[PDB]
Amino acid sequence: ECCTSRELVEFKMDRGDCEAVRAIENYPNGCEVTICADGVAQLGAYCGQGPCNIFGCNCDGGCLSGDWSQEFVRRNQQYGIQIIKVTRLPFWR
């Protein structure tokens, strides 16, 4: 399968700042981040556990796993993540 799915998440924080959760400032609309299924900011070209093929598929270890924006909130409990918007990419099909 392909590790091309990701989410664009806009949120506010009760504690900490956007950088603490590897997000970027989007003042005056909070923070924005692009995550993989593990609820962590995307760190490669795709959301594989490791490298992917030319299409973003057949990645080493398959795709990062988890419950998406819900996991982003969960793992960042200490910051109090207030979700505003979530967009699933690829959006169109």
Residue numbers in the entry: 25 to 117
What does the study report here?
The CG11501 gene encodes a small cysteine-rich protein that we named Diedel. Diedel is 115 amino acids long and contains 10 cysteines. The overall structure shows a relatively elongated shape with approximate dimensions of 60×40×40 Å3, which can be divided into two sub-domains referred as SD1 and SD2.
The final model for form A includes the entire expressed protein from residue 25 to 115, the 24 first residues being the signal peptide that is cleaved upon exportation, two extra residues (116 and 117) being cloning artifacts, one thiocyanate molecule, one ethylene glycol molecule and 144 water molecules. The main structural difference is located in the loop 51–54 with a distance between the Cα atoms of more than 5 Å for the residue 53. The change in the main chain trace is the result of a difference of peptidyl isomerization for the proline 52. Indeed this residue is in cis conformation in form A and in trans conformation in form B. Nevertheless positioning the structure found in form A in the crystal packing of form B leads to several clashes (distance below 1.5 Å) between Pro52 and Gly85 of a symmetry related molecule.
